[PDB]
């Protein structure tokens, strides 16, 4: 019944060549079944972990999906989400300034 | 520490 | 300040095969410290903060036994609720439960609570007096009646005012180096031209704990609420939180605008200004 909200961001301010963590924070959704992938240059990243499912006072769920990565000038990243409330995957490109 | 017992809606 | 211990439970039925997926997480304030996931291999309550590993094997055995008992209660409740709402066996449904207790700054019981939801909607909740129930709908009137007759609130209140706060105080002490440390936000402003005549000022709050924070923009010392883009507070992934607030301003007028940061780790709010 409720669509996921997405924020895609780095744990630390991004500097090319310095290891970091790429985060996709998905929240406000219901029910809990959800598919979240992190993409590098359009391709799914394999070693992605997530937080343990919890929820907010309106009962909507939130999860953090995350992976280690070393940003570079040319590489692009994104977060891809599928949920029953979405007709096809929602994809948000990572912007180092947000 | 969890609640020792969690009653169901209806036993 | 006050502190809370809270447990969050989600169980989701699996109509095609098998029993519900059950996930339990425990928090002290904004710190997760235990979890149980019925899909994991261990079938144990597991630690997620270093200070809970100070507890010996008796704790993990006892919490595993109780958390499995909690899972079975949620499983049977999904069956009860399917009946109360006249729903078929073919659909997947969800129960969510949150209960916990707070201590005040005086380290005494402050409040306790126990809320329950079905399919993402309020179902029943314990009232502030810890002696009565609020039902959201007519199905929950049945539960209110049955839990009244079975004096469910009385055992719950005994835990909330007793064991719950005793173990919260235990955890706060054992984990004091983190649980009772405030991490004030590390704050900075960035400037991004969007044209020759306009720029975005973004006010950043990073690495803070707990998660409660207020970020606001002012122009000439009065609020600039309407024009602010404010993202929801988000986890860094290392146990701290992040937030930012941005405004678009005419180039050359940046000095009129101030960012104001309120956080319990700050003795006084911070004020940031682009020179």
Author numbering:
A (entry chain B): 3 to 100
B (entry chain C): 1 to 11
C (entry chain A): 2 to 276
Question: What does the study report here?
Answer:
MHC class I proteins, encoded by the highly polymorphic human leukocyte antigen (HLA)-A, -B and -C genes, present a snapshot of the intracellular proteome on the cell surface (immunopeptidome) where T cells surveil the peptide–MHC complexes (pMHC) for antigens derived from foreign pathogens. The typical 8–14mer peptide presented on MHC class I comprises only around 2–3% of the amino acids in the pMHC complex and is spatially confined within the adjacent α-helices of the MHC groove, thus posing major challenges for engineering peptide-specific single-chain antibody variable fragment (scFv) binders. One peptide each from CHRNA3, GFRA2, HMX1, IGFBPL1, PHOX2B and TH were selected for preclinical development.
We then performed immunopeptidomics on eight high-risk diagnostic neuroblastoma primary tumours, focusing on HLA-A*02:01 and HLA-A*24:02 allotypes. To select those peptides with the highest potential as putative immunotherapeutic targets, we prioritized peptides on the basis of pMHC binding affinity, HLA allele frequency, degree of differential expression of parent genes, relative abundance on MHC as compared to other peptides, recurrence across multiple neuroblastoma tumours and relevance to neuroblastoma biology based on the published literature. The presence of these peptides in tumours was validated by performing liquid chromatography–mass spectrometry (LC–MS/MS) on synthetic peptides, yielding complete concordance across b and y ions. Consistent with its function in orchestrating neural crest progenitor development, PHOX2B is expressed exclusively during fetal development and is completely silenced in normal tissues before birth, as are IGFBPL1, TH and CHRNA3.
